[PDB]
Amino acid sequence: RENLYFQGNFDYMFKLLIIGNSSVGKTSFLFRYADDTFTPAFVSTVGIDFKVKTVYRHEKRVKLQIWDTAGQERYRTITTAYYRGAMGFILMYDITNEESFNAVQDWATQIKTYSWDNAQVILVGNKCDMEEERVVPTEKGQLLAEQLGFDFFEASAKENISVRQAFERLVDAICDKM
Amino acid sequence: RENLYFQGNFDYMFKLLIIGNSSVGKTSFLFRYADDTFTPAFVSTVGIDFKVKTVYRHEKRVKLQIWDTAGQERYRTITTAYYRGAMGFILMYDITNEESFNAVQDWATQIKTYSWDNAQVILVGNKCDMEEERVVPTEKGQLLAEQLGFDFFEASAKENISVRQAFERLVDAICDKM
Numbered sequence: 011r012e013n014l015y016f017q018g019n020f021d022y023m024f025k026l027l028i029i030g031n032s033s034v035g036k037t038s039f040l041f042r043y044a045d046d047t048f049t050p051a052f053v054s055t056v057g058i059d060f061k062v063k064t065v066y067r068h069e070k071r072v073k074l075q076i077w078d079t080a081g082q083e084r085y086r087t088i089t090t091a092y093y094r095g096a097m098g099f100i101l102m103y104d105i106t107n108e109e110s111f112n113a114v115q116d117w118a119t120q121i122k123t124y125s126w127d128n129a130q131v132i133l134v135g136n137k138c139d140m141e142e143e144r145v146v147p148t149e150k151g152q153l154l155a156e157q158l159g160f161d162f163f164e165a166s167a168k169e170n171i172s173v174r175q176a177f178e179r180l181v182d183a184i185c186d187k188m
Numbered sequence: 189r190e191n192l193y194f195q196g197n198f199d200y201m202f203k204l205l206i207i208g209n210s211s212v213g214k215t216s217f218l219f220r221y222a223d224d225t226f227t228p229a230f231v232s233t234v235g236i237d238f239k240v241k242t243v244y245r246h247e248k249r250v251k252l253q254i255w256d257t258a259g260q261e262r263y264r265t266i267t268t269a270y271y272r273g274a275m276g277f278i279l280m281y282d283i284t285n286e287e288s289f290n291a292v293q294d295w296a297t298q299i300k301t302y303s304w305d306n307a308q309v310i311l312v313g314n315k316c317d318m319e320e321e322r323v324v325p326t327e328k329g330q331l332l333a334e335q336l337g338f339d340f341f342e343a344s345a346k347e348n349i350s351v352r353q354a355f356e357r358l359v360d361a362i363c364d365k366m
């Protein structure tokens with residue numbers, strides 16, 4: 011369902027999705043990864059101002075994509091195409107925002123409904139640079155990740171803490187499964 | 189509505205679309221351009237087997253995209269997002285297929301309805317390598333192109349005849365307009 015074409019030849023791509031509440035740092039996290047790896051990102055607009063943000067890694071055969079949460083709430087068909095056949099997820103919350111963490115069960119259900127049976131998930135508590143504003147203890151994140159069957163890390167898009175770790179670890183979980 | 193992000197910075201991209209009847213050579217034409225320029229193309233699946241095929245040129249700031257005709261017939265919202273804010277079109281027919289040429293008025297209406305007011309269009313008679321199978325005289329293509337306000341070329345994706353000419357000429361029409 012996701013392919014790369016180059017010089018007459020085709021190969022598969024891993025569809026990896028970053029999801030979570032508006033304003034948890036999904037775009038920042040994707041863009042920090044792009045910047046870290048000297049890769050461009052592409053941003054396309056749907057409707058008034060809803061965004062699709064995409065990074066392609068050629069050698070590594072991964073497509074990383076955000077379809078904004080506010081967009082997912084407005085467009086059913088675009089959203090189901092977005093989730094359909096996703097291989098892995100970064101499921102993101104903000105350690106400084108309790109509601110974003112409370113939404114995780116709901117995002118978990120989203121993953122199982124719409125995406126591949128064996129899709130691997132990493133729960134990421136983002137904004138770990140903002141310790142002074144934390145409201146979600148690390149132990150809550152670790153324990154939910156355990157009961158939902160996800161991997162778990164805290165990260166910082168702003169400080170480049172555990173940004174690469176996330177995607178390389180996700181592809182590894184995917185390959186190990188298959 | 190189409191942006192590139194690279195190393196902390198943003199710029200605009202030109203959204204260029206290739207449209208026309210199934211099997212006129214749109215994919216072949218896009219892929220030949222990708223191959224000519226040492227660029228990858230990306231192919232994403234919507235529904236059972238409907239494809240979105242995309243080439244990005246970074247330096248030149250152009251996004252070239254096919255959303256399969258059979259897909260356009262099935263998914264309204266995806267299709268309107270596809271056309272919305274298109275800057276230019278390659279409107280393709282097959283010189284060996286009369287129906288594909290008869291559809292051109294209908295594709296022309298499509299362009300005006302759904303896309304930018306000043307969107308530039310090139311009418312391309314593809315498969316010009318197959319002279320022995322021609323059923324659409326060049327003069328018909330030239331005359332329709334004149335009455336619809338389009339540029340016009342015959343081309344061959346298979347033989348690499350007028351493939352680059354098409355996109356570089358399209359961006360030029362776009363810039364000249366603005």
Ligand SMILES: Nc1nc2c(ncn2[C@@H]2O[C@H](COP(=O)(O)OP(=O)(O)O)[C@@H](O)[C@H]2O)c(=O)[nH]1
Nearest residue numbers: 031032033034035036037038137140166167168
């Ligand atoms: N301190 C800090 N702020 C962040 C981090 N990631 C994102 N932000 C900020 O959180 C807000 C939302 O980020 P954004 O990437 O747009 O979130 P999205 O809506 O989930 O895509 C913005 O003001 C970002 O600058 C982080 O790691 N640390």
Ligand SMILES: Nc1nc2c(ncn2[C@@H]2O[C@H](COP(=O)(O)OP(=O)(O)O)[C@@H](O)[C@H]2O)c(=O)[nH]1
Nearest residue numbers: 209210211212213214215216315318344345346
């Ligand atoms: N002879 C010739 N055949 C072509 C050319 N372009 C496409 N084709 C063939 O026409 C058929 C449809 O091409 P495709 O690129 O899939 O058309 P699309 O459905 O419009 O994307 C395929 O068998 C292609 O190999 C061309 O320039 N010359």
